[PDB]
Design a protein around this ligand. Structure first.
Ligand code: HEA
Ligand code: HEA
Ligand SMILES: CCCCC/C=C\C/C=C\C/C=C\C/C=C\CCCC(=O)O[C@H](COC(=O)CCCCCCCCCCCCCCCCC)COP(=O)(O)OCCN
Ligand SMILES: CCCCCC/C=C\CCCCCCCCCC(=O)O[C@H](COC(=O)CCCCCCCCCCCCCCC)COP(=O)(O)OC[C@@H](O)CO
Ligand SMILES: CCCCCCCCCCO[C@@H]1O[C@H](CO)[C@@H](O[C@H]2O[C@H](CO)[C@@H](O)[C@H](O)[C@H]2O)[C@H](O)[C@H]1O
Ligand code: CUA
Ligand SMILES: [Cu+2]
Ligand SMILES: [Mg+2]
Ligand code: NA
Ligand code: NA
Ligand SMILES: [Zn+2]
Lengths: 79, 49, 84, 46, 98, 227, 144, 43, 514, 259, 105, 73, 58
């Protein structure tokens, strides 16, 4: 729909200096979407926007820790 | 009757001022203190690369 | 509100005794029955080694360092799970 | 009772000025010295 | 719903507490709980200042609601005047078992 | 960077820092004026043998003493808050860069497109090359495109730090578990320095920040070469 | 006469230009001749001699206004002593530099500073006012 | 304030002694530590 | 007798004297720590070691100067000596609990000394922020000893506050309303209210830090859902009131000193001074996040804390102008205590105005955690609290001791200190504007000149401190006994003579109501 | 001889033994936390109890036995107790602040939700409701005790005070049982931290308040109180109502709203 | 408030009270010099005659000193006031501080 | 001889204060004009002049040729 | 129980010069000595523990 992605756009849900929840929300939305799409046999390519946003915003170590915990079964957010 | 200040005030003022100036000038100029003043108008720039 | 009771006239021990035995202790007895009724152990949930729980940044100053102060083996897992 | 009056309402003696000087030297001198000797202690450790 | 058994102050207060209680019943104030009411404070009608010794500090609030209090020793003898407003005070010494 | 014998702020590298300099000028004039007026009145009150020691009525002069300072405060607060809200307006960044504080160095992640990240350590004094600045140079600079709005996101992986660049008017604390955002825009190419600004242990004094601002095309090629 | 510590609750004498008539006389005990002078004071003051007037004054008061208000040389002592102890401070600083401080870093060496200064000009440190603004890049010299 | 003359006058010489002892009580112990810093560190 | 009098005291004057001796000894410790700071910074490079030993010294410097020098001297020392005398009371309300407030301080100080002796010290800043102060980055006993030192100092001052509030409300002459008590008494009452409300919150926060460090709580640890910034809120909810606690009794003494050496019977604008101290005390509880403008706070919150912080300048300016108006028309007596007070007025005003600069959160982005803040607060603390302490000490030393100081020596002492503290701190404004961080053991070379001058200034203040000890020795050595004191009609604390008897006001004052 | 009504207290060793007991308890906690040893702490706890015992013993001697508590002295003690309670309110306020800060903005580590993922809160309608009725009931019975005392009724004062203490003990035993049964612990993140530190300090204050009520019970048995002079009882009742109100805030905030 | 004339008249009346006592003389002068003014000659005249009725020569001299002091640096005021008082000074035999040498430091 | 004229005798302190508070104020307006002109205006003009014809690419090329950059030779 | 407050009032008001904390008799002295001995001995022990903890241990 809209490539030439440069970086994550301003998001009125998260307008202040603390962007922690912006990273978290896009991480959740990406993996929630990917679970939905790979369940119903659809295409994860529709989840790509959320993936781009959380990759731009989230520290590598947060993503890595959250990915490890998803694999371990200890991720405390709902997906 | 003249008190301590009438008798000694001039001497104390004169010697205190002279001593203070002499020892701060000496400390400031003679013992290797690096004041690091501005290079502006003082330092000739020199090739570094 | 005003409760729904309704006395006054001047102040007294007899009134506060009436409230102690007529309202306060009956309520304790009722809540004691309500409780001694929903009591009896509850089935413990699967252990999941969540990293925000079972925190250990320094051993506890008692026991083996790994048991909380009022550790209950039935419902308090260790960082490695329930005790066997 | 207790002693009253100048030099008597204090926990230290001012009856002799040189003994006083020694006591005041020890008193203020020990407080001023202590941080230097703690620094020394921390440097000598590691 | 009837019993006693709790002592009263009349029965059981002791020491200074009892002294104050008994003096208050008489309308007396040997321990200075109340503020004295001023007289007109002229030399003919000076404020009378009780004391158990030969001098007592007076504080003079010269006018109502002045925040500044004027303090001075009042001595046995002829009435003295507040050094700010001039109102007169005279010491009346006594013994204390008044 | 600062220079020897400097009295005031580093020259502004960003428009917001420009604004802060003029607001500081507006405010320091008031500081000087009030402090000098108090010193002078101290001298007016203290330089006469004339006396007047009876009770003085206060309420008229206390009106002056409250209303005039209230007006002065409003004269400071109005441009102050204007800058605050302007600093907060939406700006649309072209680039996001993260920095993570550590004991004792900074790491940087540029993950809009590729997995680019590296560590950035103070150059030790014994390894400075001639003309380099003691305690300020780093081994890997934060290269960035000039004349573009950049979102910096700041966090920490251990204790508190704080990521500062005085010539851009930047200081954002680095707090573990938190992602703080600031914006950066340099009017000029060059090298802009800062230092860790929250006490963080043994080498707090020795984990500096160096931004290297260059044209976009140089930044793109540098980025590709850092993969 | 002789003021005692045990008199603190009694009205006392003070010389203050804002309290010209103190609460007591400076001298309360009178010799035979001073008693006779106080009696003479009840008659016309025109019949008192100058010395008798002065003696009455000095019975009532300790110092005159001119005496109690006089200026002193104390400032010389204060300013001079303060400068002495400030001077003494520089002795401590000299001691510290000789015995406590080691060499400063090699970046203060004259050649290092010359090269650093050029590198600062090459990166246009503070080019609007603070540093490079003061360099003439056209004439290769510090602006006049 | 007014006061009595000193009951135990402290002459200029006595003041110089008191001042000197006081200053040495602050300076000597700190001076000894700072003089020997290198010994403590480079240890 | 000695043990009964000085270890078992129930006497407000002797306990005041104990606090003054304690605070003076702490002052020497805090001075030595401040000279180690300035020796480290007095030339470029490393003198002592890296930032750990350096910030152990900085941390202890602040705790000693605040909790063991200023608060004990102003509140325990001058408050205990003067408040009961100024209201004609026979002692404090709780004379025996008063003695425990005193004796909790040597153990508190011992815990702080122990902190710096064990492991590598608590190199945290006096703010003790986690995670640096947590059990991973500051493993071992030092930070827990600091926490416990603060607990004991906190209990001491909370009980002291209860004592002062009760004494001042309950033990005045029955005709004296609160609006007939002297300004220093007001200043102690307000300070005590601030202590009562703020210290329990500190106690909560540092107890949370203690359990995070030792009981596996995670109040401030994100891994458990905690937040380091919560600690900062709890700490500064106390810490801003704390700086007004440090200065309010100073304001009270300055009012008395300026009135007295102006030859006035009363300060200008008494009810405005009361209003101003109450307003400062109240506003002092709603401004704390001006210590957090760089933590990542929302813009509207920054706008509020900017504005609330500035408004404190209005009642504060009423007090400055009312001191000027007290001087106006005075028969000015240029005593050494008057000089301390005049220096206070000017230096406090300088530091207040740099506070106003900092209140602008947009400029504070650049100034925060730099030496501009250090300059702001040393103008209000080392040239405000310290100058009010020295003014009150030389003014009331004859009352406490019965002996006079040598006024020429005391003026010399003032002159040296005034030069020393301004050479120390004025250049730190330049260092802060040009970007030198706080809590640094070493600095980029450009900062050398101002750090050199600042360190030289600190040595001039050392010489003043050594001279102060000698001056006190000279007074007790010569034994010039006080005779008469002017203006007792409006300075009740002098009216029982110098020193006053052990028991005063055994017979209370007579005050009628009219 | 004084002619004011205030109490000049005899020189006393208990301020010093109390201060030293604070040094021993804090250095003792340090030794326990870091040097595996309880010795200093047990000495400090012992000297603290001895100090409190003798200090408050002496206050009873000075008042009931020596008559030094004039109305003016009593009025000072009333202010002192109110101010002390105010400081304790502000102490709990810090823990309530921590609780709301963490629960109103739950971080990602928790699951970004409150209660955190993996936390199973107690049912507020079970033993926590029972505890609420117990403390509220004890506020009624202590008011009965107060009115009986003012009406000169020794027997009903003792009966009502005994009931109040029994309820305080019941609350403490119930809370101890709930602590043991709770499936979460103090190490269970900020949920367990806020829960146990806030309710635990509250439980400590219930034990303190119950001990104070028991002191009043034995003084009453020894006839110390008159129908008009009984400030130790009033202070213990004020402290007891404070403990009740803190519980009500904990119940609403942590047990109910936070569940 | 009151005119200058009313102020002055009140103070003349104060010192002119025939049986004014020593305490009232001192209270009057010590209060008067607190104001932002040098007292008019007619006030000083009444105070000096009060001194005379109280047989107190020294206080009359002291009152002249304090007039001079209240003028501060305005050196023209005291010689004018002495000029205006000379008939009274001559009538009562009051010597000035200068005539007594009491202006010497 | 001639009599001395009557001088002003009342309100000398108030008159002195009035005169000097106005002079105090006049300083501040006179200072404010100086500080605005010597500092604040000078700064606005220095920034406006600097950027008026500023060529950022040219600045960059000078820096690049001087060798100062890691990313650009 | 019987009201024996009057007996205790006589005891604690006896004109014997004793401070209130010792006026109950020899048991007060014992309890005072136990308390002060534990405090002072405990404080010396705390200093020893500081000295031990101030140095690293193998
Ligand atoms: C006695 C101590 C004291 C006092 C009184 C003050 C008073 C003030 N302080 Fe200060 N402050 C500290 C001690 C004090 N401070 C300390 C220790 C710190 C740092 C803590 C740390 O980080 O360790 C600090 C930190 C600090 C900061 C944080 C800076 C940072 O960390 O980035 C700020 C910013 O808001 C600030 C502002 C002010 C203000 C506005 C006042 C005002 O209350 C001043 C008001 C007074 C005046 C303004 C002067 C007189 C007024 C007039 C003559 C009238 C005319 C004036 C006007 C019209 C403006 N202070
Ligand atoms: C009252 C508080 C107080 C006082 C008086 C001082 C006094 C001094 N301080 Fe202090 N300082 C702090 C509180 C204070 N400081 C605080 C809170 C910090 C921040 C800590 C942190 O960052 O965490 C700090 C930080 C600080 C720093 C910054 C450290 C850094 O960021 O790395 C520096 C550096 O120069 C400094 C230097 C000095 C010096 C040279 C003095 C000298 O002026 C000292 C001179 C001596 C005196 C002023 C006299 C001492 C008083 C007496 C001797 C009592 C006499 C007793 C009687 C008369 C009864 N201080
Ligand atoms: C029944 C209620 C009363 C509790 C009695 C238990 C002893 C504690 C004494 C009371 C102190 C209260 C607050 C102390 C903080 C922690 C205690 C919290 C209450 C409690 O008892 O929490 C228990 C943990 O105790 C633990 O860690 C034990 C830790 C024990 C040592 C605490 C040491 C810390 C003391 C710090 C005090 C500082 C005070 C400063 C005062 C301020 C000065 C102004 C919970 O047990 P759990 O096994 O984790 O979960 C139960 C699972 N089945
Ligand atoms: C267990 C781990 C360590 C914790 C230690 C705490 C342990 C328990 C302590 C329980 C408190 C017991 C208090 C007993 C006080 C008895 C003395 C008393 O009650 O004294 C009364 C005065 O009140 C007074 O001092 C009022 C005195 C105020 C007492 C305040 C008590 C609360 C103290 C709490 C300590 C807080 C700890 C907080 C920790 C966060 C005496 O006057 P009356 O009663 O009028 O009698 C006079 C009449 O007889 C005359 O007719
Ligand atoms: C920050 C506050 C302190 C700053 C200012 C201190 C001023 C110093 C005063 C003198 O201090 C002494 O200086 C000596 C040297 O002058 C040292 O002797 C050392 O040096 C001598 C000469 O090398 C030897 O004789 C000695 O044995 C050796 O201890 C000595 O130990 C030290 O006490
Ligand atoms: Cu990282 Cu300071
Ligand atoms: Cu603040
Ligand atoms: Mg910071
Ligand atoms: Na250094
Ligand atoms: Na009651
Ligand atoms: Zn009066």
């Amino acid at each position: 729909k809209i490539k030439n992605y440069q970086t994550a756009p301003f998001d009125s849900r998260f307008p202040n200096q603390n962007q922690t929840r912006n990273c978290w929300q896009n991480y959740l939305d990406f993996h929630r979407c990917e679970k939905a799409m790979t369940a119903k046999g659809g295409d994860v390519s529709v989840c790509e926007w959320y993936r781009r946003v959380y990759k731009s915003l989230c520290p590598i170590s947060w993503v890595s820790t959250w990915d490890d915990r998803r694999a371990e079964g200890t991720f405390p957010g709902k997906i | 009757a003249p008190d301590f200040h009438d008798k000694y005030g001039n001497a104390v003022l004169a010697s205190g001022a002279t001593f203070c100036v002499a020892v701060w000038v000496y400390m400031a100029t003679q013992i290797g203190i690096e004041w690091n003043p501005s290079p502006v108008g003082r330092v000739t720039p020199k090739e570094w690369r | 509100a005003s409760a729904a009771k309704g006395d006054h006239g001047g102040t007294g021990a007899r009134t506060w005794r009436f409230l102690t035995f007529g309202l306060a202790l009956p309520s304790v007895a009722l809540c004691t029955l309500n409780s001694w009724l929903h009591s009896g152990h509850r089935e413990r949930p699967a252990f999941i080694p969540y990293h925000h729980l079972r925190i250990r940044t320094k051993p506890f100053s008692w026991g083996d360092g790994n048991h909380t102060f009022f550790h209950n083996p039935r419902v308090n897992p260790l960082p490695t799970g329930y005790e066997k | 009772h207790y002693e009253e009056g100048p030099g008597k309402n204090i926990p230290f003696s001012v009856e002799n000025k040189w003994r006083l000087l020694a006591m005041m030297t020890l008193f203020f001198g020990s407080g001023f010295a202590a941080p230097f000797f703690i620094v020394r202690h921390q440097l000598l450790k590691k | 719903a009837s019993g006693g058994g709790v002592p009263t102050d009349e029965e059981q207060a002791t020491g200074l507490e009892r002294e104050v209680m008994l003096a208050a019943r008489k309308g007396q104030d040997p321990y200075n709980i109340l503020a004295p009411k001023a007289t007109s404070g002229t030399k003919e009608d000076p404020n009378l200042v009780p004391s158990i010794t030969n001098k007592r500090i007076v504080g003079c609030i010269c006018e109502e609601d002045n925040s500044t209090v004027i303090w001075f020793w009042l001595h046995k003898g002829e009435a003295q005047r507040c050094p700010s407003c001039g109102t007169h005070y005279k010491l009346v010494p006594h013994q204390l078992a008044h | 960077m600062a220079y020897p014998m400097q009295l005031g702020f580093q020259d502004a590298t960003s428009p917001i820092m420009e604004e802060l300099l003029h607001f500081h000028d507006h405010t320091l004039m008031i500081v000087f004026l009030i402090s000098s007026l108090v010193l002078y009145i101290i001298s007016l009150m203290l330089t006469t043998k004339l006396t007047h020691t009876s009770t003085m009525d206060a309420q008229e002069v206390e009106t002056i003493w409250t209303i005039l300072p209230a007006i002065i405060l409003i004269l400071i607060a109005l441009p102050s808050l204007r800058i605050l809200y302007m600093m907060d307006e939406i700006n649309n960044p072209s680039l996001t860069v993260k920095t993570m504080g550590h004991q004792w160095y900074w790491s940087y992640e540029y993950t809009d497109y590729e997995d680019l990240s590296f560590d950035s350590y103070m150059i030790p004094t014994s390894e400075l090359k001639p003309g380099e600045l003691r305690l300020l140079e780093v081994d890997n600079r934060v290269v960035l495109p000039m004349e573009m709005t950049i979102r910096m996101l700041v966090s920490s992986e251990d204790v508190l730090h704080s990521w500062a660049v005085p010539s851009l008017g930047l200081k954002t604390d680095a707090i573990p578990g938190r992602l703080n955002q600031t914006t950066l825009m340099s009017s000029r190419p060059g090298l802009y320095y800062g230092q860790c600004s929250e006490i963080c242990g043994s080498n707090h004094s020795f984990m500096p920040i160096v931004l290297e601002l260059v044209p976009l095309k140089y930044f793109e090629k540098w980025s590709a070469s850092m993969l | 006469s002789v003021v005692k510590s045990e008199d603190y609750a009694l009205p006392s004498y003070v010389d203050r230009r804002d309290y010209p008539l103190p609460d007591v006389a400076h001298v309360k005990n009178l010799s035979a001749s001073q008693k006779a002078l106080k009696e003479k004071e009840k008659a016309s003051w025109s019949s008192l001699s100058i010395d008798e007037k002065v003696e009455l004054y000095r019975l009532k008061f300790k110092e005159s206004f001119a005496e109690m208000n006089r200026s002193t040389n104390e400032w010389k002592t204060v300013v001079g002593a303060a400068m002495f102890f400030i001077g003494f401070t520089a002795l401590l600083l000299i001691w510290e530099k000789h015995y406590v401080y080691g060499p400063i870093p090699h970046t203060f060496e004259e050649e290092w500073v010359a090269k650093q200064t050029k590198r600062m000009l090459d990166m246009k440190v503070a080019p609007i006012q603070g540093f490079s603004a003061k360099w003439d890049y056209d004439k290769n010299e510090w602006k006049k | 304030i007014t006061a009595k003359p000193a009951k135990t006058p402290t002459s200029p010489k006595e003041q110089a002694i008191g001042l000197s002892v006081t200053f040495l009580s602050f300076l000597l112990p700190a001076g000894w530590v700072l003089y020997h810093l290198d010994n403590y560190k480079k240890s | 007798m000695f043990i009964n009098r000085w270890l078992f005291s129930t006497n407000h004057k002797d306990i005041g004297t104990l606090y003054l001796l304690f605070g003076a000894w702490a002052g020497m410790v805090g001075t030595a720590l401040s000279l180690l700071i300035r020796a480290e910074l007095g030339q470029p490079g490393t003198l002592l070691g890296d930032d750990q030993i350096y910030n152990v010294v900085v941390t202890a410097h602040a705790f000693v100067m605040i909790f063991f020098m200023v608060m004990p001297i102003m509140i325990g020392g001058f408050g205990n000596w003067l408040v009961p005398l100024m209201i004609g009371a026979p002692d404090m309300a709780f004379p025996r609990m008063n003695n425990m407030s005193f004796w909790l301080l040597p153990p508190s100080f011992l815990l702080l000394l122990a902190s710096s002796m064990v492991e590598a010290g608590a190199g945290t800043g006096w703010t003790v922020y986690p995670p640096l102060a947590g059990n991973l980055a500051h493993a071992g006993a030092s930070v827990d000893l600091t926490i416990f030192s603060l607990h004991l100092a906190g209990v001491s001052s909370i009980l002291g506050a209860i004592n002062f509030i009760t004494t001042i409300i309950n033990m005045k002459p029955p005709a004296m309303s609160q609006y007939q008590t002297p300004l220093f008494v007001w200043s102690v009452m307000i300070t005590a209210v601030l202590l009562l409300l703020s210290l329990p919150v500190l106690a909560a926060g540092i107890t949370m830090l203690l359990t995070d460090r030792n009981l596996n709580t995670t109040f401030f640890d994100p891994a458990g859902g905690g937040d380091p910034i919560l600690y900062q809120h709890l700490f500064w909810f106390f810490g801003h009131p704390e700086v007004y606690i440090l200065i309010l009794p100073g304001f009270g003494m300055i009012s008395h000193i300026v009135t007295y050496y102006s030859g006035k019977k009363e300060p200008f604008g008494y009810m405005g001074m009361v209003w101003a101290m109450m307003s400062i005390g109240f506003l002092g509880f709603i401004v704390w996040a001006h210590h957090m403008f760089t933590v990542g706070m929302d813009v509207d919150t920054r706008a509020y804390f900017t504005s609330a912080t500035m408004i404190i300048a209005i009642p504060t300016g009423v007090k400055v102008f009312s001191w000027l108006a007290t001087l106006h028309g005075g028969n000015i007596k240029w005593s050494p205590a008057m000089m301390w007070a005049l220096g206070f007025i000017f230096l406090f005003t300088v530091g207040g105005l740099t506070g106003i600069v900092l209140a602008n959160s947009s400029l504070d982005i650049v100034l925060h955690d730099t030496y501009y803040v250090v300059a702001h607060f040393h103008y209000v603390l080392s040239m405000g609290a310290v100058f009010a302490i020295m003014g009150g000490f030389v003014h009331w030393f004859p009352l406490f001791s019965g002996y006079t100081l040598n006024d020429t020596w005391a003026k010399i002492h003032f002159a040296i200190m005034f030069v020393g503290v301004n050479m120390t701190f004025f250049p730190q404004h330049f260092l802060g504007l040009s970007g030198m961080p706080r809590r640094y053991s070493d600095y980029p070379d450009a900062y050398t000149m101002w750090n050199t001058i600042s360190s030289m200034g600190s040595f001039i203040s050392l010489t003043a401190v050594m001279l102060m000890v000698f001056i006190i020795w000279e007074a007790f050595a010569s034994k010039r006994e006080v005779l008469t004191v002017d203006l007792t009609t409006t300075n009740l604390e002098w009216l029982n003579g110098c020193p006053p008897p052990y028991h005063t006001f055994e017979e209370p004052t007579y005050v009628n109501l009219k | 001889h004084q002619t004011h009504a205030y109490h000049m207290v005899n020189p006393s060793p208990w301020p010093l033994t109390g201060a030293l007991s604070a040094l021993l308890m804090t250095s003792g906690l340090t030794m326990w936390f870091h040097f595996n040893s309880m010795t200093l702490l047990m000495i400090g706890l012992t000297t603290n109890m001895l100090t409190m015992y003798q200090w408050w013993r002496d206050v009873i001697r000075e008042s009931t036995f020596q008559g030094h508590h004039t109305p003016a002295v009593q009025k000072g003690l009333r202010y002192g107790m109110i101010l002390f309670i105010i400081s304790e309110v502000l102490f709990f306020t810090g823990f309530f602040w921590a609780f709301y800060h963490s629960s109103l903005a739950p971080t990602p580590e928790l699951g970004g939700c409150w209660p955190p993922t993996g936390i199973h809160p107690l049912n507020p309608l079970e033993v926590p409701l029972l505890n609420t009725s117990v403390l509220l009931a004890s506020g009624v019975s202590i008011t009965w005790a107060h009115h009986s005392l003012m009406e000169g009724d020794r027997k009903h004062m003792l009966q009502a005070l005994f009931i109040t203490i029994t309820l305080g003990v019941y609350f403490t035993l119930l809370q101890a049982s709930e602590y043991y049964e709770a499936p979460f612990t103090i190490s269970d993140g900020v949920y367990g931290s806020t829960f146990f530190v806030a309710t635990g300090f509250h439980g400590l204050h219930v034990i303190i308040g119950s001990t104070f009520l028991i002191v009043c019970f034995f003084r009453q048995l020894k006839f110390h109180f008159t129908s008009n002079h009984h400030f130790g009882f009033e202070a213990a009742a004020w402290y007891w109502h404070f403990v009740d109100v803190v519980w009500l805030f904990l119940y609403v905030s942590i047990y109910w709203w936070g569940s | 408030h009151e005119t200058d004339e009313e102020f002055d008249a009140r103070w003349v009346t104060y010192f002119n009270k025939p049986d004014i006592d020593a305490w009232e003389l001192r209270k009057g002068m010590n209060t008067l010099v607190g104001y932002d003014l040098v007292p008019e000659p007619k006030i000083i005249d009444a105070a000096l005659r009060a001194c005379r009725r109280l047989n107190d020569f020294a206080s009359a001299v002291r009152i002249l000193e304090v007039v001079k002091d209240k003028a501060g640096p305005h050196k023209e005021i005291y010689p004018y006031v002495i000029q205006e008082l000379r008939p009274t000074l001559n009538e009562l035999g009051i010597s000035t501080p200068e005539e007594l040498g009491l202006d010497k430091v | 001889s001639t009599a001395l004229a009557k001088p002003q005798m009342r309100g000398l302190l108030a008159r002195r204060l009035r005169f000097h508070i106005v002079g105090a104020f006049m300083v501040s307006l006179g200072f404010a004009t100086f500080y605005k002109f010597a500092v604040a205006e000078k700064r606005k003009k220095a920034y406006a002049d600097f950027y008026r014809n500023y060529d950022s690419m040219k600045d960059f090329e000078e820096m690049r040729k001087a060798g100062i950059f890691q990313s650009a030779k | 129980f019987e009201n024996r407050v009057a007996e205790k009032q006589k005891l604690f008001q006896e004109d014997n010069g004793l401070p209130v904390h010792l006026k109950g008799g020899a048991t007060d002295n014992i309890l005072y000595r136990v308390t002060m001995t534990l405090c002072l001995g405990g404080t010396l022990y705390s200093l020893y523990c500081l000295g031990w903890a101030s140095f690293p241990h193998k």
